[PDB]
Amino acid sequence: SIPHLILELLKCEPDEPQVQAKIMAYLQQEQANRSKHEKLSTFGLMCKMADQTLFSIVEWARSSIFFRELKVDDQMKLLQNCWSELLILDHIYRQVVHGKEGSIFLVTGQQVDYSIIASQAGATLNNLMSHAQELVAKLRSLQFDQREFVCLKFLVLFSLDVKNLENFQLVEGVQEQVNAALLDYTMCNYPQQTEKFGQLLLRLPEIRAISMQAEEYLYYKHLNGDVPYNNLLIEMLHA
């Protein structure tokens, strides 16, 4: 039915209605606490929402099985290695589960019409969101489920390519065991999709491609002086 390991990963999933409410409240109070003289721009609010999204990802990781056993230095190295990929994967899965045609479901728990955000976003960001939507559609066609999602998330987080980790053994172990569990799970639960395991893994390079697009966009905003100082996403980029 379900591998013990996957069940344990799932126990660490965030409380989504709580995260949604928390981020929504933060963004509301931020606008509120600002006087008419200092109201935040659209990009400004996008940046704050993105920061909060990444804060919640870090919070998730910190409390998660396996990751919580690592020294803070190793935790930073893993997150530094995959932060943009986790942001994209989080966004994509949110759309897989909650998305409606013509709309984007935000981390705040709200649907926004796609044409509205795309009008504000411009060509570059619209291209990125469109790429992400094609992956959403692909994952839906594959019948991507939450068990597979959490496996991919841990594979992204515990990546072999992380440099200078002290406890690399955990990366080795998580990689070996989560790949094995994902295979067992997909073969058991989706017997009619004989290639599902490999098809899910092949989405990871695509997630990485979208994350590069995101980093590029962020970097050009930063070159333009548009990204506020100590925005976490730009701090992650600065490395």
């Binding site: 804060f55 870090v58 919070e59 910190r62 803070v72 935790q75 930073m76 997150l79 530094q80 100590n230 976490l232 701090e235 992650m236 600065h238 490395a239």
Partner: peptide, 11 residues
């Protein structure tokens, strides 16, 4: 990356 360390260490 000071902010990241803070997020991981606080509380």
């Amino acid at each position: 990356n000071a902010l990241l360390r803070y997020l991981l260490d606080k509380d």
